[PDB]
Each structure stands twice: as structure tokens, then as C-alpha cells.
Amino acid sequence: GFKQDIATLRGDLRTYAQDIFLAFLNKYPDEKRNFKNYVGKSDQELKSMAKFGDHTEKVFNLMMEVADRATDCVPLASDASTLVQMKQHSGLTTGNFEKLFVALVEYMRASGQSFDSQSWDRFGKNLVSALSSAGMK
Ligand code: HEM
Numbered sequence: 001g002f003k004q005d006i007a008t009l010r011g012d013l014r015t016y017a018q019d020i021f022l023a024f025l026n027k028y029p030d031e032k033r034n035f036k037n038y039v040g041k042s043d044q045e046l047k048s049m050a051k052f053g054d055h056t057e058k059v060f061n062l063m064m065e066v067a068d069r070a071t072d073c074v075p076l077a078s079d080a081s082t083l084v085q086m087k088q089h090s091g092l093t094t095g096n097f098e099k100l101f102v103a104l105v106e107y108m109r110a111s112g113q114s115f116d117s118q119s120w121d122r123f124g125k126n127l128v129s130a131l132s133s134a135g136m137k
């Protein structure tokens, strides 16, 4: 289930973080509006840059902390507030997060690895609603 999925992801965190973020960027080409340094590079060209894996891995580390602290796939309001108030997230809207989790769930369902894709869809939806409640537009 969801708890095991956190363990699966953490067990190979850098690789999953890169592949899920790439799935997001490729599903939503307009979303590079927030990623000017990744324009004009293929998936393997991006994975070849240490800064890409370094940043993705730190992103998904925090995502796994928020997922692990959630109750029944409902994130804590304090974690949502953290994500809202991060300087790196100024100008984001919940639509940015909605698209990330749509791509993440799609990646999981296409994967050979078992994932509880329903729980991740719920987690993404509850994260969006919590981000809104914490003041994200
Ligand atoms: C639960 C979802 C997310 C989590 C846990 C998260 C977490 C993080 C973390 C930890 C960093 C700092 C990483 C580092 O040290 O390099 C970061 C940076 C950033 N994040 Fe998020 N993020 C999430 C969703 C998003 C989404 C959906 C977007 C936009 C579509 C976004 C845009 C950015 C940007 C632009 C930066 C700055 C990159 C830079 O210039 O260093 N994040 N995020």
C-alpha cells in the first residue's frame, strides 16, 4: 500500500525522483516555465547533469517526509504550509502540484513495480486541497 510505496521510492530515491519528474516535464511541456535551465535537453541529457539528480532527489526526499507524516493520505496542514511558504515556491499555484501528481500516478500505473496508485491519487488531491487551505492560489 501507500506506506510500502514510500519504502519502494526511498529505496531507490534518486532514480525514481528523476524518472517521475521527467514524466511530469514531458506530460506538461508548458510546465518548464518554472524550469528555465532544463529547456532544450532530452531525458538522458538531463540525467547526465549532476544538478538535475541532486535537486530531484532533495525534492522527493521532502515529498516522502510529507507522505510519511500524512494520516490516511491526508498531509499535515503544517507540511502544506511549509510547501506554500518556501521561497522556491513563490508564484506557484495548486495547478502545478495537481499536474505533478497526475503525472506521478500515471508513471506508477505504467510501471512494472506494484504501486498503490489510488492512494497516490488521493494523496495528490488532498495535498492540493491542503495547499489551498494553507494559502496557495
Ligand atoms: C510535494 C511536492 C513538492 C515538494 C516536496 C517540493 C520540494 C522542493 C524542495 C525540497 C526544493 C529544494 C530542492 C533543492 O535543494 O534543490 C524545491 C525547489 C523548487 N521547487 Fe518544489 N517541491 C514540490 C513541488 C513542486 C512543484 C509542483 C513545482 C513546480 C511545478 C516546484 C517548483 C520548484 C522550484 C522552481 C524549485 C527551485 C529550483 C531551484 O532553482 O533550485 N516544486 N522544491
Ligand SMILES: COc1cccc(Br)c1O
Pocket: 017, 021, 052, 055, 056, 057, 059, 060, 100
Ligand atoms: C528538478 O527537481 C524538481 C524540481 C522542481 C519540482 C520537482 Br517535482 C522536482 O522533482
